[PDB]
Design a protein around this ligand. Structure first.
Ligand code: NA
Ligand code: NA
Ligand code: NA
Ligand code: NA
Lengths: 392, 392, 392, 392
């Protein structure tokens, strides 16, 4: 058996041209960043992973290398189930907080342990997980069409993504609801009924404006309403789902561990769980959340937005899971989607395929890694939520 | 008006001699640590605070100085309410996690803003909060009698705290429930019926063993059962409360913001909310939680255990609030309770009094701060939770 | 420390020209009255307050000077939290009734204690409360457009208030629902979508007519439906909220203490709590109600309508609270809004600012006080509610 | 038809010798007071009533004569149902508070209208109400055995009331629950199983101590637990009822109108409604509450404690109602029970009989009324409630 010898966290940053920066309720994007986790062993088998973002890269590096890492040195990396609980109970729940950047830090390390296990077996992760459910491929959506567009501009962007071969795309809303509505109406008129239109408010609305928005999403035939309210208001999400519309209420990028999703389920407050393998606790935890969603006759469609590793880790689980695919694919300017690894966007009839090599299924460009060390750049400007909080 | 010029986080560690290290379900105590936050202004008015612990000091320093602090520089510190929400929505919820060490970091900065405001006004914080409710004083309990004791030892430690003037004390339980029960029985036999006995399992029990323990606490007339289960299992806390015993179900040191407490209230799952002003979001947040507890006809009795600043911040609010007092006082070896500041334990008829000077009400020994810089020492050993999780 | 030496209640009345008298379901206004509470101390620091109205001025004076006052003489006014509970439990709940004009009488005295504390500290009340949340200013609405208008008249009045610089206003309804509906439709057509239109039925409707009204308010995009039903029918308010419209169900001017609002919250029966610091128990109690509203992800927007002191006391708390501002400003003929104190209406971009002096933040014109002593004038004609009760 | 010409409120006080003053959670009794209401008509037919107490006599006199009375002058007193609602909607709900000393004032005037109507018809009130249900008589209990007793004293006071002919009596509890329990145990031991023992805590306990006390009341076979908690905590009363003991949960002397009782019924929170016809709204209102209790399969057993008019008004209704009788009879020193009127205690086989003359059924000693004008004496010392609130 192997022994883990080191847990490393490489802070990386890549720039975005000013005119390509986009804004949602999460804030104005400034640089696309990540931590590349590397777990090394005594026989030279290495796994890599990512704890998503944006968080703060110094906080993630310290958590991974100095809080979680020590609990792993000397251990057999094959016992990923044991190591997840050893780290959660030993340190991270109490000492970084139970719904925290520490859970995202664990997620990066858990993805690297799964990558390491697939490489040790010479199999792609989806094969360990029981092989494909989606044998034809996984239906993707273009993420996303951002704020600051007129309705003809939002419809032209959607149409462009449809032309590139997507069959679905997502619009960010929440700052100017009359304008969001006009964007949706123009987008639906442009593409017709077979392209799916998803909407994401990044927690920017209150309950009454979310109810008014849901009526427009229902009229426009939208597939889901993501983060319509603060993730802290579970009853508001039940109220939106209780309207009985065909529009799914979706959340989960900012909820952590299966415990959060069980509280939404128990309160009849969710249709689509969006737990991200790279944020909500790892592949090990997202596996459990996907199964709990199916048990409650709901769907799991992860958030995937940060880098090609968070995309690939979720894509292995989505391909192996019995849920309808609605697979998030970042189409914004992001070198971590094109230059870190050899696995790229390739759509055929609106579907992507999981990488096919061992582990996550591709190799890292270590020369790109070495050239993009973080030097203190910010990832994202201040996020929103003060308006709906009540600040004029 | 003032302008904030700097937000500083001094990482401090103080040792614990091997024989004086106690152990609970949170793990074996190794060093008593803190961050001393210092908010400076252009006119030289400084506030100090603490984000409690144990949490990793490098993660707290980076959150405070580099994630929170940039949102404060140049702002008028007098608008604490605005700054709390600017920091929560602009950075901490999304980018450090909504129930996280980022919320503890906010709490330490929020305490420092209150301390600065009281120093600016020449008033102790409790006067700003509407003055005392507890005009005679605040009833304290000795925290705690720990694991590894025989029944006669636990009874002798209790009688010792009684002899010192305490009218209540807390026993830690959860590793060996037959021994815990024998300790309680001996303790109650020793002191009779008017001394209150609190029990705290630090999340170390499952539901069935906590149901079995609650029968013993009811027979022993215990005042509350603290952290009986994982903070993640709200329904199990409802099940214990639904037994209708006179023993209060209490939790809150590891729950964050008023949102977590509202979920417990809405599920009939809590009698005593223990949100700590230095962990759950600040004096600003704990004020809202104390009022929400009173509206639901429940009580707020905070966790206070880390240092004399986390003690004092909560004591100002406790003194001002209309709850029965059951005020946590750490009686374990802790130089952060004796040597940081000029306020100490002074028990009279079982009661303590809040500091009376401006702000938090005492000044810091900055020679003590300079002599105890953290050098990478760990605060606490690995916590427990794997046993009840299922690891034999 | 100070000692309270006297609690005085000055009964005042000011006239309204016949043609400027307006009617709502509360009755036809006849004279704008108040009690000016004055709390004096042994060192000459005085606080002033008001217990709102209309009540009966002799009942309020007797309650303040002879029921509540005796409990305060000799006490340190700094312990406002203690004094509130001393008076509630000692006398007012049992001996004036738990939801009563005695709670309003306590509120006047509690505002004066807060004014006294701000003056003693040389700070505006909002600073004690943690400073501003609304750092830009507080969005006001013009209260109100009354009964007896045709639709073109109601739209002309709204348009006039918009011209004066309000961005919102409230219409009184409930006597002739077809006419109220026509008024709303004309008002919305006149101003377009960005001005907020609020509706207040002063308890004048039953459940089925309130359901029919809510449909028209939803069509007209109204911000809230205030006192749609008797305050005694909590289930009727749940039924209106359960329709799931974007129109908030609002009540609270005639509900007392946080206990009333907890019963609405627990029954899913309210969106906007309108507890008035000068009626529902004081600044101390409205602080607790504002925080309980936020904890339940609802809003607190006080009723403020009586005099410039009830306006200012609420405005200090609104400015410091994290709720959307929708701040009631009496625009009817009322000398107690223009001549009692130096703080006046001043709108900039639809917002008001809190007074900036110590305490409530302005000085009283004691020569105006001395010239407007009550001489037995009525404040308000008989109120309504017999029609919906069933009287043809 | 008649026309009302005057509504008068005679403020009366009668002393209590120091040794005969008893104390409960409502406070230490000092003077037994009342308002004797007198409604006069143009043909000289007068009705009398009482709004119970203790409530401040100047507040009651002003409410009666100057707020309620002007709505009655010139009206036909025969339309009691119309006048009740005219007064509630026209003035008292809004302008004195919906659960208030204004509702007690209404009750005293409503009693006088019933008394006038019975005198006009030459019939006792119970005949108007459909005659007797309790054709044999009404089972009374001795109210009460108070604080400050040893167990042998409380047992001897109980056995004394038994020797006088009572088959039931009430013990006041709440200051020292170990002593209360010892008093009960001694009392039950003394009288055996057929004498009913009632317990009344006058809102002086929190939920956990009331749960502990309810176990003792169940062991002692007690008939009811009255005002176990604040009247403001409906959910705590549900919790006590949900224990499923044979001990009835009873409250109502400090709850107003049928709306308060409907909220307790709808929350499964009451077994015995104690609305007093002289406090909760009148004979008119208590008739509706008694019927609402019977529809829910619960009981109405009113509080009656203030004077022989509050006694007699409730006894007419009790005699006519199909509830088990447990009729409160004040056995404490009270000249308002012996010297106001010609009806007194006459116990036969444990039962009393309602007065048999017109109206309330007796005439007033108007020389006694003229000799006991109130001169500003207090009725009751400060009540209790600060202890359970949390003041040590
Ligand atoms: Na999203
Ligand atoms: Na604890
Ligand atoms: Na109103
Ligand atoms: Na009673």
């Amino acid at each position: 058996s192997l022994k883990i010898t080191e847990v490393k966290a490489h802070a990386l940053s890549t720039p975005i041209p000013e005119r390509m920066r986009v804004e949602s309720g999460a804030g104005l994007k400034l640089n696309r960043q990540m931590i590349l986790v590397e777990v090394r062993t005594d026989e030279g088998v290495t796994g890599v992973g990512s704890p998503s973002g944006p968080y703060d890269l110094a906080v993630l590096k310290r958590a991974i290398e100095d809080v979680i890492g020590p609990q792993l040195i000397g251990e057999d990396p094959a016992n990923i189930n044991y190591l997840w609980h050893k780290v959660f109970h030993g340190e991270v729940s109490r000492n970084l907080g139970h719904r925290s950047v520490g859970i995202a830090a664990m997620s990066g390390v858990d993805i690297a342990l799964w990558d390491l296990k697939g490489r040790a077996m010479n199999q792609p992760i989806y094969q360990l997980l029981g092989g494909k459910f989606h044998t034809r491929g996984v239906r993707a959506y273009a993420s996303s069409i951002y704020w600051d567009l007129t309705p003809d501009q939002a419809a032209d962007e959607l149409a462009g993504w449809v032309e590139q071969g997507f069959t679905a795309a997502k619009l960010k809303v929440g700052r100017a609801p009359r304008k969001d509505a006009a964007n949706l109406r123009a987008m639906r008129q442009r593409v017709g009924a077979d392209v799916e239109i998803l909407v994401d408010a990044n927690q920017s609305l209150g309950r009454h404006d979310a109810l008014a928005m849901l009526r427009i999403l229902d009229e426009a035939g939208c597939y889901w309403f993501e983060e319509p309210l603060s993730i802290d208001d579970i009853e508001g999400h039940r109220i939106l789902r209780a309207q009985g519309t065909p529009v799914r209420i979706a959340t989960g990028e900012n909820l952590y561990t299966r415990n959060a999703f069980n509280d939404y389920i128990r309160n009849d407050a969710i249709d689509v769980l969006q737990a991200d393998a790279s944020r909500a606790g790892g592949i090990t935890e997202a596996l459990a959340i996907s199964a709990s969603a199916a048990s409650a006759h709901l769907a799991w469609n992860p958030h995937t937005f940060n880098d090609i590793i968070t995309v690939a880790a979720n894509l292995h689980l989505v391909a192996a899971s019995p849920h309808p695919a609605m697979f998030e694919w970042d189409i914004t300017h992001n070198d971590l989607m094109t230059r870190l690894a050899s696995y790229d966007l390739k759509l055929e009839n609106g579907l992507v395929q999981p990488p096919q090599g061992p582990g996550l299924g591709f190799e890292i460009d270590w020369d790109f890694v070495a050239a993009h060390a973080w030097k203190g750049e910010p990832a994202i400007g201040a996020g929103h939520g003060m308006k709906k909080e009540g600040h004029h």
